[PDB]
Design a protein around this ligand. Structure first.
Ligand SMILES: *[C@@H]1O[C@H](CO)[C@@H](O[C@@H]2O[C@H](CO)[C@@H](O[C@@H]3O[C@H](CO)[C@@H](O)[C@H](O[C@H]4O[C@H](CO[C@H]5O[C@H](CO)[C@@H](O)[C@H](O)[C@@H]5O)[C@@H](O)[C@H](O)[C@@H]4O)[C@@H]3O)[C@H](O)[C@H]2NC(C)=O)[C@H](O)[C@H]1NC(C)=O
Ligand SMILES: *[C@@H]1O[C@H](CO)[C@@H](O[C@@H]2O[C@H](CO)[C@@H](O[C@@H]3O[C@H](CO)[C@@H](O)[C@H](O)[C@@H]3O)[C@H](O)[C@H]2NC(C)=O)[C@H](O)[C@H]1NC(C)=O
Ligand SMILES: *[C@@H]1O[C@H](CO)[C@@H](O[C@@H]2O[C@H](CO)[C@@H](O)[C@H](O)[C@H]2NC(C)=O)[C@H](O)[C@H]1NC(C)=O
Ligand code: NAG
Ligand code: NAG
Ligand code: CA
Length: 1373
C-alpha cells in the first residue's frame, strides 16, 4: 500500500516433492520414525492428500497419534519444515543418482521406474526373475552419510525409488519382509520423480538490508542519548518485544522521532550496577543454557541444530525427575565448571631410572657436586627467602629435565649440543638429562657408542664425540674416523672398569643398557611421531617452543615450593624433587592421558540403554554391590574380541578389578572380528556362568568357560549388537573400555590396559566427572534422584557432553567451552522482559542486546521466531552506550523466516519475501543480503539499480512506487582447515582438485597459510578431493579430509565429501609428508603459457563495475579493446557486483565482438577482516584474492578499470618483460607541471616511505599469476591488509596503497608511461603517444565523468552508439 520494496531468494536446484520432504524432516536422526512412516505411505494412506497443506495436516495427526512427537517436538518440526532443511538432503540423492547411477547402469531403461540392486544386478520387478544388467562403475554399497539401514543381513539390498507413485508400495513390502526375516539389510535411495515439475525452490532463513549510502549529512549531534532513550521507549510501550522489532527494523527513520514526551525515564541508571559487575555498555551477547554463542551460530539453521542437540541432552536428564530449570542449573554449576578448568591441577609421572637400575639417563649436570655451583649454598632457606625475577641459586637437586633424543637425527642431536649445554654453561639451577631414542638400527648402535664412552672415559669424552659428530659429519651411524680421534687425546685416564674399544656387542652394555632404555621410553610413552619431554614429571611434547612452556611450569613449581616452606612442610633432610613425585604414577597411559587434552569421546548413556535394550539385557552383567555407597558407584562396560588373546586378557583384568571395587557395575560386550559365526554364542556361554563370574582363581578358568557349552544363535541379539557398534562408531574385532560413557580405545595390546590401569581410569574419571556432579547435584538438593550405578552414569555422562566443543578451539574463537551462570547476579526489573513459561521450558535463552546496534536488528528478528516455539524461554537485557561518535544505525532490516509453514489458496506452500513498507521517497539506498555463512548469492531478476535506489526516480521513470528484485542461491560452500602431520602446521601453496564421478575436475583452489584455509563453490551431492597432480602429490599424501571433526576420529581415513545441508560442509583435512621431505611446493625442483591461451584466450582481461553507468562504461572499454586488436580475448568479471541487466546482456556482446567471458567470485573468509563499505569491498577483491579467484590453468591476467578506454593492441602488455616480478603497474604522471600542489605522494609519509620508489596507479596492471602464486604474494597481501586494517584511517584507496606499501617486500615491475594517460596529471602533448586513458577524479573541477568522456575522447560516442543500437536490436529481437 505505502511505497514498498520486495526481495525474494530462490535456489539453484528444483523443489523436491513435498511428500519426501516431510518424511525426511519428520524422521531427522531416527530411523524407526522413517520406516514407521514409510509403511504408512506404502498402505496408500497418504494418497488421499491432494494438496501440500492437506498432506502437511495429515502428518501432524499421524505423528501425534503414533507417539512419534510431543508438543515440543511438533513445534520444532513445523519451524524446520518452514526452513526447508530437508530439501538439500533429498537433492544429494538425485545428484548422486544422476552422476554415478545412470552412467554405470548399462541397458535401455523404460518401465524401470523402481529397481533393487543385488550383487551388481538390477531387477525392475519385485518378482525378481530377470536381471537387466551387470552394473559398471565404482561400488554403490558405500555406506554413505544420507543412507538408512533397516535390519541386519548377510546380503545387502538397495531400492532406488520414486515414492510419489503407487508403483512403489509392492517393491517396499518385498524387502521390508525380507529384512524382517533377516535374509538381508534394507536401505532406500531416491530417484528424481517425473510427477513433479522443474520449478525452482524458494528459500528462507536470510536477511535483507537497505543501506543509506549518504551518511555525510549530520549537523544535531545529541547522539549519545539515542541508545538510552530508545531502550526506555520499549520498556514504556508495554508490548515490548514488538516495539523493539518495529523500532529496530526501521530505526534510521525514527532517530529524530525519539526524545519525545519526557522520554529518558532513567529509572535504569540503577541497572548499571549490572554494568559495574559484568558487561560493558553497547555489547551484544547471547547464551543458550549457559553456552555462549558466537555470531556465526546465530542464524536459523545454526540455532535449530543447537536446540535439537540440547533437548536430546536434557530429556535424558529429566527422566530422573528434574525440571528443565533444575537440569540447566546443574549443568552450569560452579563445582562442574571448576573441574574443566581444573587442568591447572597438574598430573605428574615418575621420570626416575630407579626401575631401570640407574642405567638409562645420561645427565650433563649434578648440582650438589659440579664445582660450577660451588659458589652456591646448599640450604633450604635459600629457596624460601626468594624475591624478584631471578631463579634461585642453590647447591641442591631440585628441578630436573629429561628429554628423549634420537642420535641419528641432526635436529635432535643439535638440541643436546646447543640447547642443553648452553643452559649448563649458563649455571641454571636445573639438572639436564637426556635419553636416546632407539627406533632404528643406527640409533641403537649410537646409543651403545655414547653409553660406552661415558662408562669408561667419562661425560666430556661422550659429549666430545657428539659435538664433533654433529659438526658437518652430522653422523646417522657411528663413525670411527671421528670416534678414534676422540679416544686418541680424550682417552687419557679412562677410570675404573677397563675398555672394550671399536666393537660393541657387550652382553650387558648392549643388552641391559639398550633394553632398559627402551623400557623407560615405553613406560612413559615418551616416543613416536612426537616425543615427550618430562620436566619435574610433567609431560611436555617436543613441539614448537616447549622450553617456553617448561619455563612456565618452572616458575609455577618454584612458587609451589616457597608456600610449603612458609608452612614448614619442608625440612633439611629431604630430596626436593620427591616433593613432586609424592603422588606421581610410575606408568603413563596415552589413552587416559592423551597429550592433546581435547582428544575425548563420550556417549549418551541413556541412549545406549534405550536403543539397544535387547543387547544390554542379555550381556553378562555383574551388578554393583547392595552394600555400597553413592561415592563408590560407577558403571563399566568392556567391549572385546573374545576370539583373540588381547580381547580375553583385557576381560580377565576387568574381572580382577571388580573383585576389589564392590561399587562398580560391569558389562561384557563380545565384539568379534568375524561375524560369519554368530556373536550370540560366546555371550550366551558367559551369561550362564554370570553368577560364578570373578571366581576365576586363574586365567585358564575363563579360557575354558568360553570354549565349553552348546548354544543356539539369538539372532535378535546379533542385530542389536551391530547397531550398538555402528551408533558408537566402533570397528569389528576392536577392544574398548567404557566407564560412565567415556570410551577409550581401540586397545591394540591388552598389556596397555591392566587391572592397575582400570583403577587409575576410575580414580581420574571419578575426580573430574563424577565428583563435580555429586557435589553440585547435592548443593541443589537433587541427590535423591541417583538410585544406582547406571542411574548415576546417565547424569555424569550427560554433563560431560554438555561441555563438548563442536567447533574446534582456535578457529572461530579461542575462548573455552564453559557454561557461565554469571548473569544470574544481575537485577532485572527495569531492563528485562521474559517470554515463555520457565516452569515448562527446556530451552533457556539470555539475550543482551544494544538497541542502537545494527547486529541487534538481526538478533531481535531471529529471537522472536524462536521464542514462538513451545518449550522455549527467553529473557532480554537492553544495554546501550553513551559513546556515540557517529550515527549508530545506518540501514533498514527485514528477516525472511516463519515459525510454521504458510499455505496457498490452491493449497501449495507459500514462498517467503522481505517487504519494506513506508520507504522515504528521496533517500538513496543500497540493497544488501545478510546471508548464512555457507551461502553464495547474486541478483538474478531486477530492473532497478540496486546500488542506487530512489523511489522518486523510479516513480518518475517507471510509474511505480513498488520495487521487486529476485536473487539466486547459486552455490553452497565446502570450506575447511588443513594441517600437516605430525608437526601440525598449515601446508601453504598446496593445490587441491574437487571431483565427481561425472567429471574429475569440478573445481580447484590453493591452501592458504591462514588456518590452512581453502574453499569450493558447490551444490548438494557426493564429491571427492584429490591433491593436484604435480609438486603437491610429489611431496604429500593426504590421509584424510576431516569430515568427522578435528579428530582423528576412527573411520575418517577417507577423502569423501558430501553436502546435504544449508550449513555446507566444514572439513579438517590432514596431510603427512612423504619420505624425508623438507621441500616446499612454491619452489620448483614449462608448457605453462600455451596451455592457458589454448583453454582461455590470447589476452585475459578482468574488471568490476558497481552501477549502471560503470557497467555502461565497461561495455565501451571492452569494445575499444576489440576494435584495437586482431587477437583472441577473454573477459573476466567479479560476478556478484554486476546487475542482472548487465549479466543478461553480455552473451549478445560476445556474439557481436567475438570474445569469450567467464564469471568468477570467492567468498570473503570468516577470519579475514571485512569491509562495511561496499566500495572498499570491491577494491579488496581486486588485490586480496588474485591467486585464488582465477583457475590454476590461467597463466596471467590484466586488470582494466571500467571508466577506461584503450587504443592499443593489448597483447603488448602480456609480452612486456616483468623481470621476475609477480605484477606490473604504471606510475603517476609527472608531465603536468602546474598540478604539483595536488601531488600528495611527494609529502612526508609517502616520500619518506617510498624513498626512491614510485607511487603507482591501480586503474591498470598485469599479474603473472603463475609467479604470483609461486612467490606466495597473496598471503602476504592478506595478512598485511588484516594488520593494517585495525586502524580505520589506514588505507584511503587500498587498491593503490597496498601494492605501494608492499613494493619493498613484493617487487612491482614499473611500466612505461605510454601505458597511461589522465588529463588531471598528464600534459596534452603526452596524449599523442598514450596507449590507454583513465578518467581520474577532477579535483580542481566538479566536471562529471560523462562530460570528461565526450570532451576528452571523441570516439567515445562512436562506441556508445554501437552498444545503443544493439541494445535496441535485442529489445526488438
Ligand atoms: C526414535 O524413535 C522412536 C519414535 O520417535 C522413539 O521411541 C518411541 O517412543 C514411544 C513412546 O513415546 C514408544 O512407545 C513405547 O511402547 C513401549 C511398548 O512397546 C512402552 O513400554 C513404552 O512405555 C514408556 O513410555 C510411556 C509413554 O506414554 C505412552 O503411554 C500410552 C499408554 O496408553 C501408549 O499408548 C503410548 O505409547 C504413549 O507414548 C510412559 O508412559 C511409560 O511409563 C514408559 O516409560 C512406550 O509407550 C515407541 O515404542 C517408540 N517408537 C515409536 C515408533 O514410536 C525413540 O525414543 C527415538 N529415539 C531417538 C534416538 O530419537
Ligand atoms: C540490585 O538491586 C539492589 C536493590 O536494593 C541493590 O542492593 C544494594 O544493597 C546494599 C546492601 O546489600 C544496599 O546498601 C547497604 O545496606 C546495608 C544494610 O541495609 C547498610 O548497612 C549499608 O550502610 C548500605 O546502605 C544498597 O543501598 C542497595 N542498593 C540500592 C540502589 O538500594 C543491588 O546493589 C543491585 N545490584 C545490581 C547488580 O544492580
Ligand atoms: C584487423 O583485420 C581487418 C581485416 O579483416 C583490418 O581491416 C581492414 O581495415 C581497413 C581500414 O580502412 C578497411 O577499409 C578494410 O576493409 C579492412 N579489411 C577487410 C578485409 O575488410 C583491420 O585493420 C585489422 N586491425 C588490426 C588492429 O589489426
Ligand atoms: C517535561 O515536559 C516538557 C517537555 O515535554 C518540558 O516543559 C519539561 O521541561 C520536561 N521536563 C521536566 C523535568 O519537567
Ligand atoms: C622431615 O624429616 C623427616 C625425618 O625426621 C622425613 O620424614 C622428611 O624428610 C620430612 N617429613 C616429611 C613429612 O616429608
Ligand atoms: Ca579509474
Amino acid at each position: 500500500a505505502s511505497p514498498s520494496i520486495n526481495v525474494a531468494l530462490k535456489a539453484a536446484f528444483p523443489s523436491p516433492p513435498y511428500l519426501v520432504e516431510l518424511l525426511e524432516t519428520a524422521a531427522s536422526d531416527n530411523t524407526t520414525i522413517y520406516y514407521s512412516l514409510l509403511d504408512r505411505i506404502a498402505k496408500g494412506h497418504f494418497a488421499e492428500a491432494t494438496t501440500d497443506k492437506a498432506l502437511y495436516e495429515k502428518f501432524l495427526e499421524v505423528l501425534r497419534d503414533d507417539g512419534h512427537m510431543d508438543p515440543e517436538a511438533l513445534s520444532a518440526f513445523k519451524l524446520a519444515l518452514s526452513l526447508r532443511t530437508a530439501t538439500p538432503r533429498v537433492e544429494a540423492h538425485y545428484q548422486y543418482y544422476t552422476a554415478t547411477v545412470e552412467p554405470s547402469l548399462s541397458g535401455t531403461q523404460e518401465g524401470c521406474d523402481q529397481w533393487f540392486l543385488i550383487d551388481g544386478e538390477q531387477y525392475c520387478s519385485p518378482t525378481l526373475d530377470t536381471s537387466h544388467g551387470k552394473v559398471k562403475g565404482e561400488d554403490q554399497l558405500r555406506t554413505l552419510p544420507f543412507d538408512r539401514k533397516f535390519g541386519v543381513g548377510s546380503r545387502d539390498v538397495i531400492l532406488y525409488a520414486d515414492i510419489t507413485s503407487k508403483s512403489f508400495a509392492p517393491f517396499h513390502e518385498v524387502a521390508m519382509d525380507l529384512a524382517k526375516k533377516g535374509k538381508a539389510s534394507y536401505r532406500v535411495r531416491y530417484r528424481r520423480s517425473p510427477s513433479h515439475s522443474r520449478e525452482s525452490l524458494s528459500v528462507n532463513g536470510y536477511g535483507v538490508e537497505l543501506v543509506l549510502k549518504r551518511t555525510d549529512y549530520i549537523v544535531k549531534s545529541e547522539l549519545a542519548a539515542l541508545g538510552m532513550k530508545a531502550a526506555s521507549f520499549v520498556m514504556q510501550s508495554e508490548k515490548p518485544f514488538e516495539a523493539l522489532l518495529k523500532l529496530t527494523q526501521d530505526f534510521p527513520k525514527y532517530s529524530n522521532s525519539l526524545g519525545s514526551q519526557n522520554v529518558s525515564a532513567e529509572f535504569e541508571a540503577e541497572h548499571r550496577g549490572n554494568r559495574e559487575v559484568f558487561l560493558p555498555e553497547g555489547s551484544n551477547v547471547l547464551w543458550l543454557n549457559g553456552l555462549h554463542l558466537i555470531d556465526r551460530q546465530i542464524q536459523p539453521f545454526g540455532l535449530v541444530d543447537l536446540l535439537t542437540r540440547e533437548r536430546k541432552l536434557i530429556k535424558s536428564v529429566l527422566d530422573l525427575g528434574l525440571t528443565g530449570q533444575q537440569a540447566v542449573d546443574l549443568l552450569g554449576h560452579a563445582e562442574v565448571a571448576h573441574a574443566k578448568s581444573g587442568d591447572d591441577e597438574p598430573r605428574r609421572f615418575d621420570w626416575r631410572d630407579d626401575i631401570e637400575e640407574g642405567q638409562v639417563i645420561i645427565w650433563l649436570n649434578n648440582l650438589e657436586k659440579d664445582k660450577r655451583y660451588k659458589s652456591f649454598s646448599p640450604s633450604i632457606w635459600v629457596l624460601i627467602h626468594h624475591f624478584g625475577h631471578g631463579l634461585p641459586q642453590i647447591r641442591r637437586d631440585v628441578f630436573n629435565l629429561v628429554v628423549p633424543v634420537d642420535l641419528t637425527k641432526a635436529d635432535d642431536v643439535k638440541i643436546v649440543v646447543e640447547g642443553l649445554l648452553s643452559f649448563v654453561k649458563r649455571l641454571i639451577p636445573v639438572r639436564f638429562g637426556f635419553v636416546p631414542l632407539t627406533p632404528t638400527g643406527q640409533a641403537i648402535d649410537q646409543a651403545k657408542v655414547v653409553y660406552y664412552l661415558l662408562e669408561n672415559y667419562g661425560l666430556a669424552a661422550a659429549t666430545a664425540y657428539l659435538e664433533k659428530s654433529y659438526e658437518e659429519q652430522s653422523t646417522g651411524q657411528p663413525n670411527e674416523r671421528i670416534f678414534n680421534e676422540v679416544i686418541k687425546d680424550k682417552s687419557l685416564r679412562p677410570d675404573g672398569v677397563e675398555l672394550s674399544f671399536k666393537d660393541i656387542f657387550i652382553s650387558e652394555k648392549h643388552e641391559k643398557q639398550i633394553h632398559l632404555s627402551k623400557h623407560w621410553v615405553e613406560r612413559l610413552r615418551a616416543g613416536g611421531d612426537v616425543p615427550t619431554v618430562f620436566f619435574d614429571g610433567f609431560p611436555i611434547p617436543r613441539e614448537d617452543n616447549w622450553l617456553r612452556v617448561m619455563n612456565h611450569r618452572l616458575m609455577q613449581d618454584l612458587q609451589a615450593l616457597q608456600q610449603a616452606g612458609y608452612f614448614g612442610m619442608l625440612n633439611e633432610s629431604m630430596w626436593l624433587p620427591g616433593f613432586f613425585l609424592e603422588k606421581a604414577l610410575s606408568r603413563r597411559n596415552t589413552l587416559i592421558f592423551p597429550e592433546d587434552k581435547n582428544e575425548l569421546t563420550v556417549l549418551n548413556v541413556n541412549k545406549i540403554y534405550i536403543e539397544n535394550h535387547d543387547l544390554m539385557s542379555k550381556v553378562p552383567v555383574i551388578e554393583a554391590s547392595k552394600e555400597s555407597t553413592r561415592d563408590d558407584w560407577a558403571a563399566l562396560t568392556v567391549v572385546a574380541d573374545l576370539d583373540d588373546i588381547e580381547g580375553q586378557e583385557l576381560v580377565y583384568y576387568a574381572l580382577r578389578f571388580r573383585k576389589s571395587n564392590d561399587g562398580v557395575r560391569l558389562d561384557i560386550v563380545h565384539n568379534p572380528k568375524d561375524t560369519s559365526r554368530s556373536p550370540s554364542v560366546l555371550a550366551q556361554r558367559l551369561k550362564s556362568r554370570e553368577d560364578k563370574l570373578l571366581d576365576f582363581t586363574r586365567f585358564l578358568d575363563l579360557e575354558t568357560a568360553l570354549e565349553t557349552g552348546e548354544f543356539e544363535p539369538d539372532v535378535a541379539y546379533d542385530a542389536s549388537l551391530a547397531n550398538f557398534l555402528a551408533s558408537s562408531n566402533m570397528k569389528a574385532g576392536d577392544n574398548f573400555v567404557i566407564l560412565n560413557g567415556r570410551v577409550l580405545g581401540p586397545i591394540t595390546s591388552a598389556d596397555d590396559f591392566k587391572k592397575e590401569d582400570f583403577e587409575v581410569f576410575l580414580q581420574a574419571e571419578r575426580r573430574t566427572r563424577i565428583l563435580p556432579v555429586y557435589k553440585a547435584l547435592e548443593d541443589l538438593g537433587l541427590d535423591d534422584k541417583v538410585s544406582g550405578p547406571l542411574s548415576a552414569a546417565k547424569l555424569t555422562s550427560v554433563t560431560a557432553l554438555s561441555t563438548i566443543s563442536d567447533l574446534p578451539q582456535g578457529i572461530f574463537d579461542n575462548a573455552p567451552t564453559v557454561r557461565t551462570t554469571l548473569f544470574k547476579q544481575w537485577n532485572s526489573t527495569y531492563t528485562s522482559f521474559e517470554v515463555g513459561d520457565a516452569s515448562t521450558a527446556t530451552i533457556f535463552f539470555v539475550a543482551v542486546i544494544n538497541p542502537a546496534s545494527e547486529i541487534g536488528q538481526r538478533w531481535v528478528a531471529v529471537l522472536k521466531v524462536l521464542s514462538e516455539l513451545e518449550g522455549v524461554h527467553l529473557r532480554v537485557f537492553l544495554n546501550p552506550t553513551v559513546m556515540i561518535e557517529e550515527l549508530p544505525v545506518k540501514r533498514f532490516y527485514r528477516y525472511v523466516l516463519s515459525s510454521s509453514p504458510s499455505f496457498d489458496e490452491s493449497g501449495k506452500v507459500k514462498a517467503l519475501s522481505a517487504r519494506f513498507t513506508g520507504v522515504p521517497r528521496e533517500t538513496l539506498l543500497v540493497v544488501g543480503m545478510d546471508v548464512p555463512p555457507a551461502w553464495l548469492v547474486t541478483s538474478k531478476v531486477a530492473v532497478d539499480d540496486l546500488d542506487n535506489l530512489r523511489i522518486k526516480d523510479i516513480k518518475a521513470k517507471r510509474g511505480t512506487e513498488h520495487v521487486e528484485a529476485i536473487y539466486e542461491l547459486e552455490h553452497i560452500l565446502i570450506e575447511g582447515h588443513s594441517r600437516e602431520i605430525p608437526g601440525a602446521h598449515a601446508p601453504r601453496g598446496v593445490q587441491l582438485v574437487l571431483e565427481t564421478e561425472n567429471n574429475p575436475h569440478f573445481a580447484d583452489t590453493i591452501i592458504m597459510a591462514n588456518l590452512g584455509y581453502f574453499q569450493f563453490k558447490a551444490n548438494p551431492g557426493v564429491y571427492n578431493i584429490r591433491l593436484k597432480e604435480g609438486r603437491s602429490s610429489e611431496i604429500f599424501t593426504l590421509e584424510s579430509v576431516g569430515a568427522k571433526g578435528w579428530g582423528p576420529i576412527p573411520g575418517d581415513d577417507n577423502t569423501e565429501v558430501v553436502l546435504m545441508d544449508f550449513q555446507g560442509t566444514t572439513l579438517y583435512p590432514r596431510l603427512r609428508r612423504k619420505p624425508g621431505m623438507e621441500e616446499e611446493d612454491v619452489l620448483e625442483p614449462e608448457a605453462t603459457k600455451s596451455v592457458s591461451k589454448t583453454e582461455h584466450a590470447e589476452i585475459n582481461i578482468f574488471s568490476v563495475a558497481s552501477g549502471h553507468l560503470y557497467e555502461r562504461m565497461l561495455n565501451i572499454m571492452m569494445a575499444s579493446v576489440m576494435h584495437h586488436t586482431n587477437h583472441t580475448v577473454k573477459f573476466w568479471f567479479i560476478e556478484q557486483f554486476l546487475s542482472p541487466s548487465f549479466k543478461d546482456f553480455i552473451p549478445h556482446m560476445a556474439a557481436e565482438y567475438g570474445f569469450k567471458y567467464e564469471m568468477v567470485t570467492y567468498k570473503w573468509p570468516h577470519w579475514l577482516r571485512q569491509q562495511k563499505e561496499k566500495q572498499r569491498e570491491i577494491w579488496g577483491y581486486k588485490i586480496l584474492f588474485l591467486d585464488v579467484l582465477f583457475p590454476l590453468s590461467l597463466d596471467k591476467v590484466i586488470f582494466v578499470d571500467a571508466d577506461q578506454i584503450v587504443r592499443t593492441d593489448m597483447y603488448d602488455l602480456v609480452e612486456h618483460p616483468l623481470d621476475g616480478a609477480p605484477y606490473g603497474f604504471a606510475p603517476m604522471c609527472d608531465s603536468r607541471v602546474e598540478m604539483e600542489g595536488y601531488r600528495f605522494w611527494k609529502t612526508g609519509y609517502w616520500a619518506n616511505y617510498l624513498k626512491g620508489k614510485p607511487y603507482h596507479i591501480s586503474a591498470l596492471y598485469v599479474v603473472d599469476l603463475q609467479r604470483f602464486r609461486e612467490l606466495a604474494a597473496g598471503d602476504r597481501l592478506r595478512q598485511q591488509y588484516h594488520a593494517l586494517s585495525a586502524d580505520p584511517n589506514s588505507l584511503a584507496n587500498l587498491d593503490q596503497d597496498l601494492p605501494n606499501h608492499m613494493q619493498f617486500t613484493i617487487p612491482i615491475a614499473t611500466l612505461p608511461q605510454e601505458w597511461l594517460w589522465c588529463e588531471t596529471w598528464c600534459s596534452d602533448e603526452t596524449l599523442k603517444d598514450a596507449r590507454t586513458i583513465d578518467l581520474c577524479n577532477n579535483p580542481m573541477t566538479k566536471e562529471p565523468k560523462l562530460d570528461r568522456a565526450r570532451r576528452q575522447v571523441p570516439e567515445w560516442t562512436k562506441y556508445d552508439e554501437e552498444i545503443a543500437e544493439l541494445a535496441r536490436r535485442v529489445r526488438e529481437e
